[PDB]
């Protein structure tokens, strides 16, 4: 029905070597059947504590998955979501300054 909108970001502005929280805010999707994995160099992170499933005014769900992570100079973090509307899983790389 409706495709998710993904934002991969950090709780605080990223400074390498300092602990932070990598958020993957998946919003606007329907139905609620979703799978979200936070990746470090393509490898799944464990403890991807997310939030409780709610929805907006237009009945579209929004879900926040967040890990604790330490940004580094050349390690790349991404969020891999999968939904009914997505033909293949769609991976959004975390941009340090976006």
């Amino acid at each position, epitope marked *: 029905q409706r495709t998710p909108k993904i934002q991969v970001y950090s709780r605080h502005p990223a400074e390498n070597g300092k602990s932070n929280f990598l958020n993957c805010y998946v919003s606007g999707f329907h139905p609620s059947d979703i799978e979200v994995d936070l990746l470090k160099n*393509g*490898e799944r*992170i464990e403890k991807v504590e997310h939030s409780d499933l709610s929805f907006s005014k237009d009945w579209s769900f929004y879900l926040l998955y967040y890990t604790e992570f330490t940004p580094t100079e*050349k*390690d*790349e973090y*991404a969020c891999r979501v999968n939904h009914v509307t997505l033909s293949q*899983p769609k991976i959004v*790389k975390w941009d340090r300054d976006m």
Partner: antibody
Amino acid sequence: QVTLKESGPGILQPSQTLSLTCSFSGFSLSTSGMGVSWIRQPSGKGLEWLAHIYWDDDKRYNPSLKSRLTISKDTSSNQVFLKITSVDTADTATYYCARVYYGYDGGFFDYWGQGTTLTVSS
Amino acid sequence: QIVLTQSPAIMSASPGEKVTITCSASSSVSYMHWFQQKPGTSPKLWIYSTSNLASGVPARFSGSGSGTSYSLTISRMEAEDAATYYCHQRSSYPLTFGAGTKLEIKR
């Protein structure tokens, strides 16, 4: 089917410039979570990872060869290029291009090319 | 850089012997991946994430370990198991392979 095929010179003189190309089929480098990486195997020694390019034109190099290595992609023609400037006899190896796909678990170098052997000597 | 050392540089086991390769990482790695390279061929993904068999990998193989010490195990060796096995990590982006554990048939 997923196919990767390296190409390049078979013999180079020292201090020359190496230009490898990896033309692939069966997958699109524009797909999210996709990447192609360059690994070389000196003769029979262990594997060494050289460079990696992402679906969003992000390049990761080996720090021991970062100044010499240059990686680029041409997703319109489905090719990945590697450039090693000022090659030495230590660059004699079989060069592999391997695909990396984040979409499904297990895409880390899931497919390799047959490898292009390169001899650098005078 | 996370440099990986495999304890047996050369390992001989007869068909039927349980084989255990061990990869030791200088720093903690989330996962360790294993590749098999029989001579004259490109390396083949074997254990794609620390326990998981790749496509076509025989069920006799198994991966284990966590942190800075991982292992590849053959429950019951076959003659076709003789090859070189490299342990590879992706946690730190200077991706490093192992020096290789040339697994040969004991005779």
